[PDB]
Design an enzyme around this catalytic site. Sequence first.
Site, PDB file in Angstrom:
ATOM      1  N   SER A  51      -6.720   5.032  -2.855  1.00 29.82           N
ATOM      2  CA  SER A  51      -6.379   5.663  -1.588  1.00 29.82           C
ATOM      3  C   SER A  51      -7.083   7.007  -1.468  1.00 29.82           C
ATOM      4  CB  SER A  51      -4.868   5.861  -1.487  1.00 29.82           C
ATOM      5  OG  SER A  51      -4.400   6.695  -2.531  1.00 29.82           O
ATOM      6  N   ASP A 108      -9.149   2.475  -0.305  1.00 28.49           N
ATOM      7  CA  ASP A 108      -7.915   2.008   0.309  1.00 28.49           C
ATOM      8  C   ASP A 108      -7.435   2.940   1.416  1.00 28.49           C
ATOM      9  OD1 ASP A 108      -5.703   0.468   0.826  1.00 28.49           O
ATOM     10  OD2 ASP A 108      -4.541   1.250  -0.866  1.00 28.49           O
ATOM     11  N   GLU A 118      -7.771  -3.343   9.952  1.00 31.43           N
ATOM     12  CA  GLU A 118      -6.376  -3.753  10.115  1.00 31.43           C
ATOM     13  C   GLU A 118      -5.940  -3.849  11.585  1.00 31.43           C
ATOM     14  OE1 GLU A 118      -3.554  -1.625   7.726  1.00 31.43           O
ATOM     15  OE2 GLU A 118      -1.850  -2.197   8.986  1.00 31.43           O
ATOM     16  N   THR A 132      -1.525  -4.389  -4.413  1.00 33.44           N
ATOM     17  CA  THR A 132      -0.422  -4.124  -5.330  1.00 33.44           C
ATOM     18  C   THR A 132      -0.506  -2.702  -5.876  1.00 33.44           C
ATOM     19  OG1 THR A 132      -0.684  -6.435  -6.032  1.00 33.44           O
ATOM     20  CG2 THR A 132       0.920  -5.080  -7.227  1.00 33.44           C
TER      21      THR A 132
END
Lengths: 294, 297
Positions: free
Chosen positions: B49, B82, B134, B244
Amino acid sequence: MLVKGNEILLKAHKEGYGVGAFNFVNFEMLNAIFEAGNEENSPLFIQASEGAIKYMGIDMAVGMVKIMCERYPHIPVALHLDHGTTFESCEKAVKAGFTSVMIDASHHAFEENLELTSKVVKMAHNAGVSVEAELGRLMVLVNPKEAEQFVKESQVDYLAPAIGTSHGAFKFKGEPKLDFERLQEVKRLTNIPLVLHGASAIPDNVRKSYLDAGGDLKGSKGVPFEFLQESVKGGINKVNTDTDLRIAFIAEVRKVANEDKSQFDLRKFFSPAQLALKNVVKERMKLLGSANKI
Amino acid sequence: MLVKGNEILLKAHKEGYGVGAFNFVNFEMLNAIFEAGNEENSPLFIQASEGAIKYMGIDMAVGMVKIMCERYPHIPVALHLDHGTTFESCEKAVKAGFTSVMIDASHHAFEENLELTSKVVKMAHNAGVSVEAELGRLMGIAVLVNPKEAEQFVKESQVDYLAPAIGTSHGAFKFKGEPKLDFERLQEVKRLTNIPLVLHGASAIPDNVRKSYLDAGGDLKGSKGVPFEFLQESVKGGINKVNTDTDLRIAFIAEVRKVANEDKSQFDLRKFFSPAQLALKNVVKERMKLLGSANKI
Ligand SMILES: O=C(COP(=O)(O)O)N(O)CCCOP(=O)(O)O
Ligand SMILES: O=C(COP(=O)(O)O)N(O)CCCOP(=O)(O)O
Ligand SMILES: [Zn+2]
Ligand SMILES: [Zn+2]
């Protein structure tokens, strides 16, 4: 930027100050040390025990230090193998990119220690790597006359004289006592940079934070700031520090675990830990007089 | 060795299995993930991230992965950004050595999300880097993905993979009651796009991990993740990348808390993180076999 360990310690030997040799086992520890050296404008002596290398993998140990050197190009940095127990180990460190290796054979008899150390010097010096040896036992004491010949015939870059210290938070089962008269004889007879092992101090603030977080340091005792400075005046140029870094780091980890029991974000655990570790290093640098040396 | 994220996901997409996308923030997490992929013979999708990159430094993040790839030259490894929030952020990852980047603009209207994604795609594709986008808002129970909207979005942006909102969310608290995902909506998106799909907030919070955390004096306040059955349903539905993170954190810190309670005089970091790595490694190993990425190398 990696440089010979001697390049750093010869300057400290000339001008009469001590450079902290700090141990690391991962990223958190390494990052806090570099940031401390950057904000104190101090030379950095980064150490890695064979137990730490095993843990990280020698490739990651050197790889991470190299990366840190790039982001802090203006800082002199020496990568030191801490307490190498065999010729092979020191050789592996040399091949990996280490700029300094210690061959600990103090448990041997003089002749054995000297022969093994000399063998390491021949190998390391060939590849442009500094070497550290040890006389005496971290528990007996060093023989100044032994040190004289030992240094002369081995041509080792720096020596670690046993003058009463030992690793761990429990160095003195009484009043902290070091043989400074013996240290000065060694310095006069060898005239090279000297190293002090088990030189953590366990500062009041560090102990306090650890105990507050439910930690147990009952009966712990390190080398007082007073003695650490006396050592430098005595000729100590390389000061090994590990326990202090660990305690200060885990103190914040234990705290975070207590404050918030639903906290599982590693960054929330290791951010305060890095800060607390960096501050210990920053203070130690100023204590030994390695601050503003760049 | 670093490989474009698409290289790994395209194989999963056409063979019908899921590859675990595991986040990391330091050496311990990364090492445990690699050893898991090595012991399970599974392709590795490693992501960080913007918060992780801030914490590590993008130079260290990429640097550590490359070192791990060298000690494991037989394992396909994708370095993924991420939740990149800006073009500049994605551009930095590309230049730093990332092989895959995500441009999260799902909070924007269709047009804006498409405009930004396309710009990132053109840049990333120019450097041989894959892109993820997304559609829909990552929230629990319009917020769910519009299948038709996904079709045009993919067709116009030429993005490599898409993360459709079907009910999941980040954190240990995903479901307040009965777990529920829109698998019908998932299958329509898969049919209309025909590309690798990504599932966010896909931690399961296994019982052995929950128990372990609670034992060490941890507090999971009515936490609930995606059941193992749902994850398998997702893969059969078209999911190929499974994010995950929470599972790893919890399993890791559980062992940290344990050591702190067991021995209060213990301050050797290696004594804390060795068990923490092991616990994390086992979580990843089990997830790899669950999603079906084990033995694909
Ligand atoms: O001198 C010291 C320790 O000094 P300190 O305990 O006073 O900090 N060292 O060289 C530290 C040696 C590291 O050992 P290990 O990683 O195997 O536990
Ligand atoms: O999908 C997920 C996490 O899913 P999970 O919480 O279910 O494990 N991710 O992409 C992880 C996002 C990282 O966030 P942060 O800023 O706290 O580092
Ligand atoms: Zn020592
Ligand atoms: Zn996510």
